[PDB]
């Protein structure tokens, strides 16, 4: 019949809940009570990146720790030099409204997207010198929210269509579509081995996917409200996501469970960005207030405060080699930390 | 080559300022409303290129979004004004229209930004109350206790029943706007049907700009 489907679904949810409860023999806070606390860490702004005409919404580091990509609502994809602050490129976006920007690991391509429902990718190594859009992807009927690069030919995009899409640059058409989410998926992160990608939506749930099988593998719904940003752990089997409820939770793919919850009574605003360190020792999260907070991944302790922004933070990034940290806010400034 | 690289940076930022200065003389606008209301009368984001009194107005109309409106609005914190369109002709969707109104009025990001109202199809409301098949406006019975205000003079040759209906809608619109937000921003209730919309929107945009400027001067 029809009610039997809902009965079986409820039985399955109860079974997975019981399995997760049984697998939760203990928590790793007790284990980490032995380890030495990381202590207070203070970082200074080693570079102030002035030049943006409007509020910054997203950013992505390159393979090297010297090239910076920043996107603002004015519609200008501008590439900066981390070491010497000089502007490298300035790509005038066709649509002013943008919300995400990704830098290819090879460095030859850059992509951006937003409310235009267009995943515009640009070639930075043109023989003509100027930056031109290689192609635009219009398969998604919802607002673009995040994009990440697998290689020079494949890009994974998350949009407001409650779906995640994997694209092929050579053909310009969708390769695989992920539709297991009920809320609009917004934040998208790849594993270091480029085998699995995890993402979150407004349904207070984070789901892990495999790019080729085109199906959901794991789901996490430990949050109590809308979640905003989510990123992969350095090793590859874990991830942590921020949320609008002023809490951060880290999950392990093998454990299929929440391990810590990063929450403080002082904090009243939600998380807007999240990124780990090179080793995963330090968990960095951008908050909706005028500052940024840094957490310890294992001990879930408060490490330091990153001030210097007169308006809400909107983006955060960490170098591949771990030498620098870039945090962008609506104040039209990119602040580089270390 | 620091000198050559610096000159390229000096070239880029000058164009950014030159192309960013022209982005300030043009004022951005946001359009929101129900599908029933004739928003287009006044792809993804639709931008209208029109200007009045030597200043360009950029009206941003959204499409494709199904129901979510609480966070895609985050991008529109900078736009100085928001246009709300209400299809007051139909009473069935009036209740859900105000639920949307209360949603964006109490947004955690739209707390210092005013809104401008455009009750489209005001004529269709007029013939509906003139004829039958219309009662209570499908509202709570509190409309009966309402009385027409004499503070504002109606447009001449008006129907006293029509004026009673529209002013009641404005009165609740004023009530819902003054319920929360305090003096941070003020809703602007205006009517529309109409070649005077371009002039009407300009004065409303001038008012908030004037009001915001005095707010920043603390006088």
């Amino acid at each position, epitope marked *: 019949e029809l009610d039997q489907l809902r009965q079986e679904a409820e039985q399955l949810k109860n079974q997975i809940r019981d399995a997760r409860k049984a697998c939760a023999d203990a928590t790793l806070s007790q284990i980490t009570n032995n380890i030495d606390p990381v202590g207070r860490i203070q970082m200074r702004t080693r570079r102030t990146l002035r030049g943006h005409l409007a509020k910054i919404y997203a950013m992505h580091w390159g393979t090297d720790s010297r*090239l910076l990509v920043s996107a603002s609502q004015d519609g200008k994809l501008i590439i900066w030099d981390s*070491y010497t602050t000089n502007k490298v*490129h300035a790509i005038p976006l066709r649509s002013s409204w943008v919300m995400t920007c990704a830098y290819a690991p090879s460095g030859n391509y850059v992509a951006c997207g937003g409310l235009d429902n267009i995943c515009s990718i640009y070639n930075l*190594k043109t023989r*003509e*010198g*100027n930056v031109r859009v290689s192609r635009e992807l219009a398969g998604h009927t919802g607002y673009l929210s995040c994009c990440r690069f697998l290689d020079d030919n494949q890009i994974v995009t998350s949009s407001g269509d409650t779906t995640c899409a994997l694209w092929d640059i050579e053909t310009g058409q969708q390769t695989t579509t992920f539709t297991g989410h009920t809320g609009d998926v917004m934040s998208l992160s790849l594993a270091p081995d480029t085998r699995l990608f995890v993402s979150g939506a407004c349904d207070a749930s984070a789901k892990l996917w495999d790019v080729r099988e085109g199906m959901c593998r794991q789901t996490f719904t430990g949050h109590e409200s809308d979640i905003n940003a989510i990123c992969f752990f350095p090793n590859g089997n874990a991830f942590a996501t921020g949320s609008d409820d002023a809490t951060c939770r880290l999950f392990d793919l093998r454990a299929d469970q929440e391990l810590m919850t990063y929450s403080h009574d002082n904090i009243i605003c939600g998380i807007t960005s999240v990124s780990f360190s090179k080793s995963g020792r330090l968990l960095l999260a951008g908050y909706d207030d005028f500052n940024c907070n840094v957490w310890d991944a294992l001990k879930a302790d408060r490490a330091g405060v990153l001030a210097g922004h007169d308006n809400r933070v909107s983006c955060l990034g960490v170098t591949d080699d771990g030498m620098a940290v870039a945090t962008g806010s609506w104040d039209s400034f990119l602040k580089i930390w270390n | *080559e620091d000198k050559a690289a610096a000159e*390229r940076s000096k*070239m880029i930022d000058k164009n950014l300022r030159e192309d960013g200065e022209k982005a300030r003389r043009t004022l951005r606008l946001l359009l929101l409303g129900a599908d029933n209301s004739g928003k287009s009368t006044i792809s993804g984001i639709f931008e209208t290129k029109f200007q009045v009194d030597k200043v360009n107005f950029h009206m941003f109309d959204v499409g494709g979004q199904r129901d979510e409106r609480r966070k895609w609005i985050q991008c529109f914190n900078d736009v100085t004004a928001i246009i709300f369109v209400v299809d007051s002709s139909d009473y069935n969707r009036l209740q859900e229209a105000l639920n949307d109104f209360k949603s964006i009025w109490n947004n955690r990001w739209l707390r210092t930004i005013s809104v401008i109202l455009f009750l489209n199809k005001q004529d269709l409301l007029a013939e509906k109350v003139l004829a039958g098949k219309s009662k209570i406006e499908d509202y709570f019975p509190e409309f009966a206790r309402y009385t027409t205000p004499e503070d504002a003079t109606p447009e001449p040759g008006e129907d006293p029943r029509v004026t009673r209906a529209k002013y009641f809608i404005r009165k609740e619109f004023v009530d819902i706007s003054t319920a929360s937000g305090d003096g941070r921003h003020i809703c602007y209730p205006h009517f529309t049907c109409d070649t005077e919309n371009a002039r009407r929107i300009f004065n409303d945009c001038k008012d908030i700009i004037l009001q915001m400027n005095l707010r920043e001067y603390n006088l």
Partner: single-chain antibody
Amino acid sequence: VQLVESGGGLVQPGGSRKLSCSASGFAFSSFGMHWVRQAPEKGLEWVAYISSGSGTIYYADTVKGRFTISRDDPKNTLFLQMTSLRSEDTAMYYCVRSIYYYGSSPFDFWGQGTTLTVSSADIVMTQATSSVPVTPGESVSISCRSSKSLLHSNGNTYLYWFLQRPGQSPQLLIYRMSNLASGVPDRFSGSGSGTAFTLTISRLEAEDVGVYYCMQHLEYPLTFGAGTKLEL
């Protein structure tokens, strides 16, 4: 991307003439332009340089304050005013196009050129050898010596390599250490220890024959080393 230079020929010494180069296939306003001279059967030599927007204009120390180079982006043409002409000014003038940023490829495209015939305390680039016959299929390596170390404190050197096949303009081969240029095979490799800079070729092919040129970019005078020719 194509550069065509018009003007020149036989000129009375001491006269004046205008040299114009036409650029196409790229945004002229965003590129820096260089002029290099090649006197008949001699080595390369820098002449003048103009940047994007003509913010800074530089000239060779030998002809400083003598020539005049101008550009016009709307008309997409580059100009070089020949104020005076001597026996030293007869050369194979090439027009070079480049940008300067992180990961850029300076001196990557060179124009065909136009022929003009007349009727201290700076870094000098020298090569140990001047010519060597190399049979096809083997590996050929050359070395260069610089007056001063090119290892800038930023973290990279500024040694450029070029191949001037007989009958066409030189083309860029290597612009930095541990990386390769565009449109060139991977057999070319280069390295430097700060004093002696060397270029190695994995396997020389028929089209690889020609004369190799080297130019440093630390210090704008931009001296060109003596050409090393290969024979098969």
